[PDB]
Design an enzyme around this catalytic site. Structure first.
Site, PDB file in Angstrom:
ATOM      1  N   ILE A  21     -11.522 132.118  94.024  1.00 54.32           N
ATOM      2  CA  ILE A  21     -10.875 130.876  93.601  1.00 54.32           C
ATOM      3  C   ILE A  21      -9.881 131.128  92.469  1.00 54.32           C
ATOM      4  CG2 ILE A  21     -11.200 128.530  92.635  1.00 54.32           C
ATOM      5  CD1 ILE A  21     -13.867 128.365  94.066  1.00 54.32           C
ATOM      6  N   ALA A  25     -12.792 130.215  82.080  1.00 51.51           N
ATOM      7  CA  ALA A  25     -13.063 130.640  80.705  1.00 51.51           C
ATOM      8  C   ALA A  25     -14.043 131.813  80.619  1.00 51.51           C
ATOM      9  CB  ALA A  25     -13.576 129.466  79.871  1.00 51.51           C
ATOM     10  N   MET A  28     -14.449 135.601  86.562  1.00 51.44           N
ATOM     11  CA  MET A  28     -14.142 135.343  87.967  1.00 51.44           C
ATOM     12  C   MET A  28     -14.955 134.188  88.541  1.00 51.44           C
ATOM     13  SD  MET A  28     -14.267 137.910  91.267  1.00 51.44           S
ATOM     14  CE  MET A  28     -12.788 138.779  90.764  1.00 51.44           C
ATOM     15  N   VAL A  29     -14.290 133.340  89.329  1.00 47.59           N
ATOM     16  CA  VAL A  29     -14.940 132.259  90.055  1.00 47.59           C
ATOM     17  C   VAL A  29     -14.632 132.388  91.549  1.00 47.59           C
ATOM     18  CG1 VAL A  29     -15.237 129.751  90.249  1.00 47.59           C
ATOM     19  CG2 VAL A  29     -14.597 130.765  88.045  1.00 47.59           C
ATOM     20  N   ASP A 139     -14.719 119.831  73.826  1.00 48.76           N
ATOM     21  CA  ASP A 139     -13.550 120.421  74.496  1.00 48.76           C
ATOM     22  C   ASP A 139     -13.164 119.646  75.758  1.00 48.76           C
ATOM     23  OD1 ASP A 139     -11.402 122.172  74.576  1.00 48.76           O
ATOM     24  OD2 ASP A 139     -12.463 123.738  75.687  1.00 48.76           O
TER      25      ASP A 139
END
Ligand SMILES: Nc1nc(-c2cccc(Br)c2)c2[nH]cnc2n1
Length: 341
Positions: A21, A25, A28-29, A139
């Protein structure tokens, strides 16, 4: 182990058919097929153990998300890591797969008033639950608001969160660093450590403005520029509001500025719903003590189609209240144990 873009992405036999994807933060996703639940999911690889600060953020993310259960908060479905602390190098967090985030959506899509209303309602509904747990997100920004194909909205990333501490909020001028710049309340630069709930309401106000026009309302170019943009729209603070700032460096900085007029919201946003702008004004109030609170915002006329306090749940178990990375690793191991084997 499976590899993606040349790096280890070791999510075992349960999760297959990986697709990259991007980078978040934490690193890796990917998406993957969950062979148990028969649906595709999102998986985030975290590698924090070499640094104390990374371990702190990872423990916050995991501990808070595991305690919370709310329709408008992402939560955690599964956590993958080695069977022993010695062999644990990476931790993988598994979550519901979403279609997009509000950052990506705002880059190319104009929102209807109905979509703005619905998104804002869901953000505040989730935020009510977070605040009722005595927690500050700290945040909030469009990229931390995820959406599925039917526009269900989920607040994500609690790695920067804190337990509220209003009694210890005061500090000096130009020292504090809380939230992401464009979404940062004026008092952070003046006299606040960001330990009160009003910090989050400011960020939501910034998000509402950005939904109205597709552009950030206060686009500071760097840390020191941010207050210039805020004051350029709100205008000069009143004497009463200045009197609430006891710190002399902060108060005298504001007194040294030439007069600035308020820019009317309806001139900035000539196609906006008047009720949306009334609520916007109350969220983007300079004085944090006068700023609207989450439960008041939910009750505002703009949100009348959705408002239902009995269907806006609060937390069962609020969080009532220097460790080396080795101790934090142990805590992360223990927090993730429930998902073994
Ligand atoms: N499609 C998608 N992306 C992310 C995501 C979240 C943060 C960064 C990046 Br790159 C992707 C998700 N987090 C939880 N479900 C998710 N679904």
């Amino acid at each position: 182990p499976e590899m993606v873009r040349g790096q280890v992405f070791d999510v075992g036999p349960r999760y297959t058919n990986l697709s990259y994807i991007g980078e978040g933060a934490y690193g890796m996703v990917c998406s993957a097929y969950d062979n148990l639940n028969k649906v595709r999911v999102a998986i985030k690889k975290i590698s924090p153990f070499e640094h104390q600060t990374y371990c702190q953020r990872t423990l916050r993310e995991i501990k808070i998300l595991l305690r919370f259960r709310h329709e408008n908060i992402i939560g955690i479905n599964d956590i993958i890591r080695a069977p022993t602390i010695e062999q644990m190098k990476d931790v993988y967090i598994v979550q519901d797969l979403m279609e997009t985030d509000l950052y990506k959506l705002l880059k190319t899509q104009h929102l209807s008033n109905d979509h703005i209303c619905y998104f804002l309602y869901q953000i505040l509904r989730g935020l009510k639950y977070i605040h009722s747990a005595n927690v500050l997100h700290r945040d909030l920004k469009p990229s931390n608001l995820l959406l599925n194909t039917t526009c269900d909205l989920k607040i994500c990333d609690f790695g920067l969160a804190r337990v509220a501490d209003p009694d210890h909020d005061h500090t000096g001028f130009l020292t504090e660093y809380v939230a992401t710049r464009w979404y940062r309340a004026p008092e952070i630069m003046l006299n606040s450590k960001g330990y009160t709930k009003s910090i989050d309401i400011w960020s939501v106000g910034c998000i509402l403005a950005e939904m109205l026009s597709n552009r950030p309302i206060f686009p500071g170019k760097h840390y020191l520029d941010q207050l210039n943009h805020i004051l350029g729209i709100l205008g000069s603070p009143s004497q009463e509001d200045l009197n609430c700032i006891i710190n002399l460096k902060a108060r005298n900085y504001l007194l040294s500025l030439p007069h600035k007029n308020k820019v009317p919201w309806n001139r900035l946003f000539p196609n906006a719903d008047s009720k949306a702008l009334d609520l916007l004004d109350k969220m983007l109030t300079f004085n944090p003590h006068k700023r609207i609170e989450v439960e008041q915002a939910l009750a505002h006329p703009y949100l009348e189609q959705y408002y239902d306090p009995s269907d806006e749940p609060i937390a069962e178990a609020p969080f009532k209240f220097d460790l080396p990375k080795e101790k934090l690793k142990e805590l992360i191991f223990e927090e993730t144990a429930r998902f073994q084997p």
